[PDB]
Design an enzyme around this catalytic site. Structure first.
Site, PDB file in Angstrom:
ATOM      1  N   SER A  64      14.366  56.409  -0.610  1.00  0.00           N
ATOM      2  CA  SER A  64      14.393  55.567  -1.802  1.00  0.00           C
ATOM      3  C   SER A  64      13.261  55.848  -2.760  1.00  0.00           C
ATOM      4  CB  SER A  64      14.378  54.067  -1.460  1.00  0.00           C
ATOM      5  OG  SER A  64      15.664  53.708  -0.967  1.00  0.00           O
ATOM      6  N   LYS A  67      14.156  56.973  -6.217  1.00  0.00           N
ATOM      7  CA  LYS A  67      14.422  56.061  -7.327  1.00  0.00           C
ATOM      8  C   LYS A  67      13.326  56.121  -8.373  1.00  0.00           C
ATOM      9  CE  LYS A  67      17.069  52.687  -4.560  1.00  0.00           C
ATOM     10  NZ  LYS A  67      17.115  53.399  -3.264  1.00  0.00           N
ATOM     11  N   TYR A 150      18.874  44.333  -3.634  1.00  0.00           N
ATOM     12  CA  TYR A 150      18.498  45.741  -3.602  1.00  0.00           C
ATOM     13  C   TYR A 150      19.712  46.622  -3.261  1.00  0.00           C
ATOM     14  CZ  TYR A 150      15.703  49.859  -2.423  1.00  0.00           C
ATOM     15  OH  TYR A 150      15.140  51.113  -2.384  1.00  0.00           O
ATOM     16  N   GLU A 273       7.891  48.892  -7.370  1.00  0.00           N
ATOM     17  CA  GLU A 273       7.470  47.500  -7.209  1.00  0.00           C
ATOM     18  C   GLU A 273       6.016  47.357  -7.655  1.00  0.00           C
ATOM     19  OE1 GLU A 273       8.083  46.927  -3.013  1.00  0.00           O
ATOM     20  OE2 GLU A 273      10.199  47.388  -3.196  1.00  0.00           O
ATOM     21  N   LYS A 313       6.076  51.958  -3.423  1.00  0.00           N
ATOM     22  CA  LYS A 313       7.487  52.108  -3.050  1.00  0.00           C
ATOM     23  C   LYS A 313       7.585  52.756  -1.675  1.00  0.00           C
ATOM     24  CE  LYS A 313      11.900  51.819  -3.744  1.00  0.00           C
ATOM     25  NZ  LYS A 313      11.970  51.403  -2.312  1.00  0.00           N
ATOM     26  N   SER A 316      12.996  55.815   3.156  1.00  0.00           N
ATOM     27  CA  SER A 316      13.341  56.395   4.441  1.00  0.00           C
ATOM     28  C   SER A 316      14.711  57.062   4.343  1.00  0.00           C
ATOM     29  CB  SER A 316      13.379  55.345   5.554  1.00  0.00           C
ATOM     30  OG  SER A 316      12.221  54.509   5.546  1.00  0.00           O
TER      31      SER A 316
END
Length: 360
Positions: A64, A67, A150, A273, A313, A316
């Site tokens: 992730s 992103k 999410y 985040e 962030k 995995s």
């Protein structure tokens, strides 16, 4: 006394090295950047069977953390005038016009607030036609914009739209525009044959080597990037120093740092985040709790706009773990890459201990 490079290595040895034995992790790379100096620490094996040591050339899957690149690409397209975040996806993917999903805007897709998109694409959504049908069969559940859930398909659709707006496939958006502009030379959506000798095996929970490419093509913006430790340190450097890049990528990076709403102490930025700094350890752990990651949560407007902030962030894949964190006003960040998953809380805890102990 002790040189800074050795002090940093000692802190990483104290906090990250024990995780290798605790979680039976074959290989790990940890990097720190502080005041524009980079420190790279490699442990273990990128391939157990080949006895190949993890090193600066080792390529890991980011999960992730991919992103963050999708968000940067969207910030780039927005600041070039190719998209507005108030647009809806059918403006670009015309087959979505006059469908329920065409009421959701691009910012809502990018920040997981459509109201009815789950964590993953369904297992049987594999081909491009199935992805289109999936989005055309989408119907609202919760009110659009009200709840964060999410979601890989949500940001996957965002990335597909970003790529459409730039008249290139998503892989080419990253590999030909975004990675070159950030100065990354060993980051990929598709690892070429001439780099396969540098692509770490991932290791599953039975310590078996695995090489898995998951989901449909349009899931690549959610989880499909691979990179090396030096490239990830360069990416942190770009986030710490956007003013050092040309206007379009500088503005793209800044776009990813803008908080959009809150869920309790977490600020949702684009990809990243974001948190008030200093952040308590529990604030950072809460961002990865089951409540936040797996369940829908009402979003609230930002009230305190934090002057002093930090960003992180996790990511995995079946065989890999990643964590990236940076603190602009301390001029510091950290990247962890492993070729076996370990609990997110352990990544966050170890990075917190290292970053708080490094001499300022």
């Amino acid at each position: 006394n002790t040189p800074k490079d050795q002090e940093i290595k000692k802190l990483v040895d104290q906090n990250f090295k024990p995780l290798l034995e605790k979680y039976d992790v074959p290989g790990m790379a940890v990097g720190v950047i502080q005041n524009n100096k980079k420190y790279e620490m490699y442990y273990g094996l990128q391939s157990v069977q080949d006895k190949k040591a993890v090193n600066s050339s080792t390529i890991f899957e980011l999960g992730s953390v991919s992103k963050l690149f999708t968000a940067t690409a969207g910030g780039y397209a927005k600041n070039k005038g190719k998209i507005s975040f108030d647009d809806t996806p059918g403006k670009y993917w015309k087959e979505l016009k006059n469908t329920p999903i065409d009421q959701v805007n691009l910012l809502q897709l990018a920040t997981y607030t459509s109201g009815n998109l789950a964590l993953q694409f369904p297992d049987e959504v594999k081909t491009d036609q199935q992805v289109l049908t999936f989005f055309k069969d989408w119907k609202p559940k919760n009110s659009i914009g009200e709840y964060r859930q999410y979601s890989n398909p949500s940001i996957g659709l965002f990335g597909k739209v970003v790529a459409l707006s730039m008249n290139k496939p998503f892989d080419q958006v990253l590999e030909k525009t975004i990675f070159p502009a950030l100065g990354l030379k060993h980051s990929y959506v598709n690892v070429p044959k001439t780099q396969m000798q540098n692509y770490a095996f991932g290791y599953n929970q039975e310590n078996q080597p695995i090489r898995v490419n998951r989901g449909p093509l349009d899931a690549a913006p959610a989880y499909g990037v691979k990179s090396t430790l030096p490239d990830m340190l360069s990416f942190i450097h770009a986030n710490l120093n956007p003013q050092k890049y040309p206007a379009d990528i500088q503005r793209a990076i800044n776009e990813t740092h803008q908080g959009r709403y809150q869920v309790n102490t977490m600020y949702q930025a684009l990809g990243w985040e974001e948190f008030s700094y200093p952040a308590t350890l529990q604030t950072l752990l809460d961002s990865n709790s089951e409540q936040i990651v797996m369940k829908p949560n009402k979003v609230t407007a930002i009230s305190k706009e934090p002057s002093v902030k930090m960003y992180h962030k996790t990511g995995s894949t079946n065989g890999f773990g990643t964590y990236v964190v940076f603190i602009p006003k301390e001029n510091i960040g950290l990247v962890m890459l492993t070729n076996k998953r370990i609990p997110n809380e352990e990544r966050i805890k170890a990075a917190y201990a290292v970053l708080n102990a490094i001499k300022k």
